[PDB]
Amino acid sequence: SDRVRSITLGNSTITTQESANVVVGYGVWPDYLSDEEATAEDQPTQPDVATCRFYTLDSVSWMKESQGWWWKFPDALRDMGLFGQNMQYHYLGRSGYTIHVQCNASKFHQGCLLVVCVPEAEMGAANINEKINREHLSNGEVANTFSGTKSSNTNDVQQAVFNAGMGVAVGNLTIFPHQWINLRTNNCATIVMPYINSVPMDNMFRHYNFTLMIIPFAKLDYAAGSSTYIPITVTVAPMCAEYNGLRLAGHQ
Amino acid sequence: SDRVRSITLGNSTITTQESANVVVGYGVWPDYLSDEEATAEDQPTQPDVATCRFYTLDSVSWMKESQGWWWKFPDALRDMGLFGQNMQYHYLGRSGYTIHVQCNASKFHQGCLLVVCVPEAEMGAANINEKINREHLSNGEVANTFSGTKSSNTNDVQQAVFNAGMGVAVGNLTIFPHQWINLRTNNCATIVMPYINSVPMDNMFRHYNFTLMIIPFAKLDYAAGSSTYIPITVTVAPMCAEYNGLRLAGHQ
Amino acid sequence: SDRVRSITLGNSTITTQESANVVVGYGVWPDYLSDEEATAEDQPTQPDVATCRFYTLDSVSWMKESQGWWWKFPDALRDMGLFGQNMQYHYLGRSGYTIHVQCNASKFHQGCLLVVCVPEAEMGAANINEKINREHLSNGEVANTFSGTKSSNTNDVQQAVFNAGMGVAVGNLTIFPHQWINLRTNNCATIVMPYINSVPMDNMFRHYNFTLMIIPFAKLDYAAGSSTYIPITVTVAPMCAEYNGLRLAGHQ
Amino acid sequence: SKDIYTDAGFITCWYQTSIVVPAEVQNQSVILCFVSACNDFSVRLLRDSPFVRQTAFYQ
Amino acid sequence: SKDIYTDAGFITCWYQTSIVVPAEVQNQSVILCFVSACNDFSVRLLRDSPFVRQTAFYQ
């Protein structure tokens, strides 16, 4: 069967038995920066498998009236072992990513999830002409949560699901690399993002590269007696990461 | 997997994912009448895909104590688009048929159906030496229903399931082209009947060619909380139909 | 699919549709005794398919707090047709065995069984320095049952599951040819034991060759409304049996 | 027909283990039995069937 | 846009039979509908979209 997939990176391995098709990127596979498109002059640090491995983020709980969660991924991996340590000592860095989102239920359950990677998802503010705090955009490994109604918390992101924070129709987010976790048949949420930017290397802290969003379009629904606690676990790997411009320890 | 089948006719397409084996005919596939077995002299009307396409009949509801339903198929397709219109303007006509019967449930359900095409199923009357009205034999696209006990409605068909209207043992009806819809594993009720008669062309109204019967041998049975409304949908196509002897509009 | 297996012996046939892999022996297949390792001088009786066929033993009921059952197999087949009759007329005999253990449930059930064939499973007594009656070791086709606590019946076997009667750790019994019947996915309990002894032929009554044990490690557990009666059926075949030293009828 | 010289045997079916169902699934189910003949089956002496019975002409 | 000369038809979906579920399974479920274009789709006359609206300059 093609429902089974093993993914091996570093000293970490993910096995899935209800994959559908491992979704992977814009057609492009991640690779190291060539020296014909390069800008910086000193020797890069291709560190090892010590960064190119899976890291598990926190789990979010999918209830009957949950709306959606999001992450910012160069910033979410900022305390995840030696990867984050390289972020704190180098000025420029660069990596693709293997995102694998897991979630499981039983056959008596129903509900459908959308898992999108959105490049440059510049969020809009809840009150219009007002600053946004960094803790409301990216909270590290901890997810920020959309709402159903419009939000009006001060110095916060406008969080409605039907506008996705950015101000578009949420059914139009299937233009980005995505999958669905239909609980009837899926768990295979890969998106192997390449490096996507407008410059050959970039700073990990000053720039957010993309945004993972997990939005349930068909909400979770079950009969009385089934397991009511259904977690969603997000695991993320850097691929072909390299670092440049070593100096003192950075901005925590 | 061989559980999946697509059937394409005209501008209509049926997809099934729990087929078992598409059942098809006496071994013979339908074909147009050759000119070495032909009788009528003027040019036939092989109309188009405008008749060779699927038509959906009415749905019958399968309850716990339902007994069986039947149709008469040159007569059941008498208001089904241009097919029926050709029936009203020609004297002689001829076609095979692709019958596809659909029915679905869940895995907590149980029950088994028999789907038979019976050529020349001449029904017997409820009171013995008395005429039968045409509305009790064929009611168009609307099914007539068998009973459990013997029936005594006036000018009506003797409708017991254990004699099938004709006067035989109902377990002997597997001599005709058939299938079973076991709700454990099926939906694949094709019977691709060829043209079967004792004359090379025949009248659509004055003669009934065959009779579809759907008889549950293992009755529908479920626990409390499952879906109690289970419909059964019958879809039927003419194949290689042709028409002959055009005159004024016929007998409605 | 490789989940399906047919096993044909004599005039008997077992079909399984949820096999996993038919487990079979120490790598060795049973075969008749060669004449270069033989000891007895007269012509052996390779009787026919009349012994090499399946026999069904009694069924044991698997409850929520059941502990384990055992058999002694040259002695358990002592009234099973002509096989047992040959045991009563010959002094020396020899056979391999095809053991097939069956057990089934639904998908809402859970529980896991261990099926081991243990050669020379010499049981220990409940009170220490005291004889054991033969009816407590082998009760024919009727299973003896382990317990949870230590036992102190007189002239009886020490029956704790966590010592398996013999005095070892019960998680170490996977060194012998075995399977698991996980009710999630199995029924395929073959063990095709060869002839294993330290002599080329042996007496069927005076010696027990091996011991079948069915021990639930993950106990049977279901929700209210499922079928509470779950039987376990053990079917056993002799293979390449032969007999030697014919005399009067033996020891019942 | 029945004579004692050509007795043919018996056909029995046995609960071997059990029927095992989960919760909220109906326990009582139904087996259907079929019969047919193989490719070595043969019949020999034409007689009239003992099931046809007529008293007067059908008119 | 809408004119009567280039009407294009109707899209309907029909309960054909039913939704059949076992016990302790939720009856009410949800269909999601997608739309896209084929490999013979083409657009022709550049105009401005009727959805952009501006009253004053954004500052």
Short mmCIF file of C-alpha atoms in Angstrom, two decimals, chain A residues 26 71-73 99 114-123 164 166 168 172-178 191 193 196 208-213 215:
data_model
loop_
_atom_site.label_atom_id
_atom_site.label_comp_id
_atom_site.label_asym_id
_atom_site.label_seq_id
_atom_site.Cartn_x
_atom_site.Cartn_y
_atom_site.Cartn_z
CA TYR A 26 6.28 24.23 -5.00
CA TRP A 71 2.87 29.62 14.00
CA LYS A 72 5.80 31.61 12.57
CA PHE A 73 8.49 29.14 11.71
CA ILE A 99 6.64 20.21 8.11
CA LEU A 114 -6.71 22.61 6.39
CA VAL A 115 -2.93 22.84 6.80
CA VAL A 116 -1.40 25.71 4.79
CA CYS A 117 2.10 27.17 4.61
CA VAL A 118 1.71 30.84 3.66
CA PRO A 119 4.84 32.82 2.69
CA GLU A 120 4.96 36.42 3.99
CA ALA A 121 1.65 36.24 5.87
CA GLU A 122 1.69 39.83 7.10
CA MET A 123 -1.04 39.98 9.75
CA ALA A 164 -7.40 34.55 8.10
CA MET A 166 -4.53 38.89 6.32
CA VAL A 168 -8.70 37.59 2.12
CA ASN A 172 -8.74 31.08 -1.34
CA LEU A 173 -5.82 29.91 0.86
CA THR A 174 -5.53 26.69 -1.28
CA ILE A 175 -3.23 28.61 -3.65
CA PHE A 176 -0.31 27.93 -1.24
CA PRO A 177 1.20 24.46 -0.57
CA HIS A 178 -1.31 22.68 1.62
CA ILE A 191 4.93 20.47 3.15
CA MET A 193 9.02 24.21 1.70
CA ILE A 196 11.58 31.31 -0.49
CA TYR A 208 9.48 35.72 9.39
CA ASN A 209 9.64 33.44 6.36
CA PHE A 210 6.20 31.80 6.36
CA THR A 211 3.22 30.94 8.55
CA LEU A 212 1.64 27.54 9.22
CA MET A 213 -2.12 27.61 9.68
CA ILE A 215 -8.02 25.78 10.18
#
